[PDB]
Design an enzyme around this catalytic site. Structure first.
Site, PDB file in Angstrom:
ATOM      1  N   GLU A 128       0.787  -1.230   0.000  1.00 12.48           N
ATOM      2  CA  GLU A 128       0.000   0.000   0.000  1.00 12.48           C
ATOM      3  C   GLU A 128       0.822   1.285   0.000  1.00 12.48           C
ATOM      4  O   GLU A 128       0.534   2.213   0.751  1.00 12.48           O
ATOM      5  CB  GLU A 128      -0.999  -0.022   1.164  1.00 12.48           C
ATOM      6  CG  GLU A 128      -1.997  -1.170   1.086  1.00 12.48           C
ATOM      7  CD  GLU A 128      -2.989  -1.228   2.263  1.00 12.48           C
ATOM      8  OE1 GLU A 128      -3.015  -0.263   3.085  1.00 12.48           O
ATOM      9  OE2 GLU A 128      -3.742  -2.256   2.376  1.00 12.48           O
ATOM     10  N   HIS A 207     -10.379  -5.926  -3.280  1.00 12.89           N
ATOM     11  CA  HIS A 207     -11.564  -5.532  -2.518  1.00 12.89           C
ATOM     12  C   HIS A 207     -12.509  -4.761  -3.440  1.00 12.89           C
ATOM     13  O   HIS A 207     -12.294  -3.589  -3.703  1.00 12.89           O
ATOM     14  CB  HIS A 207     -11.171  -4.674  -1.337  1.00 12.89           C
ATOM     15  CG  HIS A 207     -10.323  -5.386  -0.331  1.00 12.89           C
ATOM     16  ND1 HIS A 207     -10.787  -6.446   0.411  1.00 12.89           N
ATOM     17  CD2 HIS A 207      -9.050  -5.180   0.062  1.00 12.89           C
ATOM     18  CE1 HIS A 207      -9.834  -6.859   1.228  1.00 12.89           C
ATOM     19  NE2 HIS A 207      -8.761  -6.114   1.026  1.00 12.89           N
ATOM     20  N   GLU A 236      -6.597 -10.492  -1.669  1.00 12.93           N
ATOM     21  CA  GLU A 236      -7.514 -10.196  -0.578  1.00 12.93           C
ATOM     22  C   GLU A 236      -8.946 -10.038  -1.080  1.00 12.93           C
ATOM     23  O   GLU A 236      -9.692  -9.150  -0.643  1.00 12.93           O
ATOM     24  CB  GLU A 236      -7.050  -8.932   0.161  1.00 12.93           C
ATOM     25  CG  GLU A 236      -5.597  -8.987   0.607  1.00 12.93           C
ATOM     26  CD  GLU A 236      -5.241  -7.879   1.550  1.00 12.93           C
ATOM     27  OE1 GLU A 236      -6.165  -7.238   2.082  1.00 12.93           O
ATOM     28  OE2 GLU A 236      -4.045  -7.641   1.735  1.00 12.93           O
ATOM     29  N   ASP A 238     -12.624  -9.881  -1.870  1.00 16.62           N
ATOM     30  CA  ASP A 238     -14.002  -9.947  -1.408  1.00 16.62           C
ATOM     31  C   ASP A 238     -14.838  -9.016  -2.278  1.00 16.62           C
ATOM     32  O   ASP A 238     -14.298  -8.080  -2.903  1.00 16.62           O
ATOM     33  CB  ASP A 238     -14.139  -9.691   0.106  1.00 16.62           C
ATOM     34  CG  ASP A 238     -13.267  -8.574   0.606  1.00 16.62           C
ATOM     35  OD1 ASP A 238     -13.160  -7.535  -0.072  1.00 16.62           O
ATOM     36  OD2 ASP A 238     -12.671  -8.647   1.693  1.00 16.62           O
TER      37      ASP A 238
END
Length: 303
Positions: A128, A207, A236, A238
């Site tokens: 990030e 995400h 990650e 979802d």
């Protein structure tokens, strides 16, 4: 096989993984699903900086090792998350700046990778580092203030600390090919490959929600990154609302890119999610498979 996500993925040489939380390993319904369905594990929190070096120069590997040990005892590989990050820094590191911060960052990488040397398939070495302000540039973090070469240094450090690990750059909101953040990352990775900086993989957090919706140009993103001479992973995943079609689309995007290593969903059941109110995963709180589960499984089995 055929009947579980991990085994389906493995037919194409890929993995299907999940985030595991150490607090949930005493939950039998949780570990039943996790053990059966996934062949890759990421520690949700237990391998972050404040988890592993909460005091300066003193490492704490208990919780990290509990996740690692559960994974390996149940036949999974493990992704390490994460070695260098502007967030979740212990108080002692937040205080540091310049060359002293730079050295702490290096010593952290060495200590954590050293402890798990040979045991970790992929490391999120840097996490990030790009801004969400639309400029496509770096965050103004204490790390960035050490100098722009900090990421390159982290990667070279990590290569030496465990030569066997794939070294990943991991970020979110880098899935839409048209976004400035995406392009800023693409341009860093391209520069890195031109200069011989040792990055093996780019992780796309994936995400997907109303503030960052899935776009079919994700495949283009994956393809363009792969063509730089790196692998790509979905780290990650979802999806807010857990649409079957979106889950199948993401899956087929990975299956379409040969250097796509696999897909990690960020949790086992909706109840385990950081966004549990969004029900964004493949199993319900009672452990039943959602419609998206079937869509993902069919896509993986469809090759």
């Amino acid at each position: 096989a055929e009947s579980t996500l991990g085994a389906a993925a493995a037919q194409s040489g890929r993995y299907f993984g999940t985030a595991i939380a150490s607090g949930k390993l005493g939950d039998s319904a949780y570990t039943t699903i996790a053990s059966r369905e996934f062949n890759m594990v990421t520690a949700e929190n237990e391998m972050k900086i404040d988890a592993t070096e909460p005091q300066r120069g003193q490492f704490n590997f208990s919780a990290g090792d509990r996740v690692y040990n559960w994974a390996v005892q149940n036949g999974k590989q493990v992704r390490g998350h994460t070695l260098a990050w502007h967030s979740a820094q212990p108080g002692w590191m937040q205080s540091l700046s310049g060359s002293t911060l730079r050295q702490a960052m290096i010593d952290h990488i060495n200590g954590v990778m050293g402890h798990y040397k040979g045991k970790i398939a992929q490391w999120d070495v840097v996490n990030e580092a790009f801004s969400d302000d639309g400029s496509g540039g770096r965050r103004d973090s204490n790390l960035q203030r050490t100098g722009n070469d900090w990421i390159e240094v982290a990667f070279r450090t990590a290569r030496a600390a465990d030569p066997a690990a794939k070294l990943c750059y991991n970020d979110y909101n880098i899935e839409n090919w048209t976004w400035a953040k995406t392009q800023g990352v693409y341009n860093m990775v391209r520069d890195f490959k031109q200069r011989g900086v040792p990055i093996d993989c780019v992780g796309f957090q994936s995400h997907f929600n109303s503030g960052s919706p899935y776009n079919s140009n994700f495949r283009t993103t994956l393809q363009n990154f792969a063509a730089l001479g790196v692998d790509v992973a979905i780290t990650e995943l979802d999806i807010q609302g857990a649409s079957s079609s979106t889950y199948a689309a993401v899956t087929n995007d990975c299956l379409a890119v040969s250097r796509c290593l696999g897909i990690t969903v960020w949790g086992v059941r909706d109840t385990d999610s950081w966004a549990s109110g969004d029900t964004p995963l493949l199993f319900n709180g009672d452990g039943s498979k959602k419609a998206a589960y079937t869509a993902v499984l069919n896509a993986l089995n469809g090759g």
